[PDB]
Amino acid sequence: RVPNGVSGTVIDVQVFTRDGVEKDKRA
Amino acid sequence: KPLVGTGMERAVAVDSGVTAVAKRGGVVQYVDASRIVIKVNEDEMYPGEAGIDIYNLTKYTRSNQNTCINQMPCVSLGEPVERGDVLADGPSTDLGELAL
Amino acid sequence: TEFLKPRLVDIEQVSSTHAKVTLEPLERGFGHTLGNALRRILLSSMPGCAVTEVEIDGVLHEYSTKEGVQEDILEILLNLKGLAVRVQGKDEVILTLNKSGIGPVTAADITHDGDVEIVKPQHVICHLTDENASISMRIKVQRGRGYVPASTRIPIGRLLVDACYSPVERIAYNVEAARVEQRTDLDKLVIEMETNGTIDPEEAIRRAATILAEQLEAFVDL
Amino acid sequence: VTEFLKPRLVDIEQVSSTHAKVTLEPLERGFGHTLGNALRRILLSSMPGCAVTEVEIDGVLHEYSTKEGVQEDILEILLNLKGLAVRVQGKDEVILTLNKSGIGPVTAADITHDGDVEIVKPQHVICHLTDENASISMRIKVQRGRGYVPASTRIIGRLLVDACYSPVERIAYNVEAARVEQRTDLDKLVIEMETNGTIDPEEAIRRAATILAEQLEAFVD
Amino acid sequence: EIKELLKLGDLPTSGQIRLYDGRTGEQFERPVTVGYMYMLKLNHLVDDKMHARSTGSYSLVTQQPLGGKAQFGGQRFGEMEVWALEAYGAAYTLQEMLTV
Amino acid sequence: NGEPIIVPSQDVVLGLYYMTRDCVNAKGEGMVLTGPKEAERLYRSGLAS
Amino acid sequence: GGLPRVADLFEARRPAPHDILRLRGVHAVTRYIVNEVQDVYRLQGVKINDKHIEVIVRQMLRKATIEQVEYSRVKIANRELEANGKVGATYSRDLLGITKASLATESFISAASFQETTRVL
Amino acid sequence: LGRVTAEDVLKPGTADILVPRNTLLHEQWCDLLEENSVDAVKVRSVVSCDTDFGVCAHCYGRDLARGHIINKGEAIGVIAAQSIGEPGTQLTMRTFHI
Question: What is the similarity comment for this entry (chain B)?
Answer without folding.
Answer: Belongs to the RNA polymerase beta chain family.
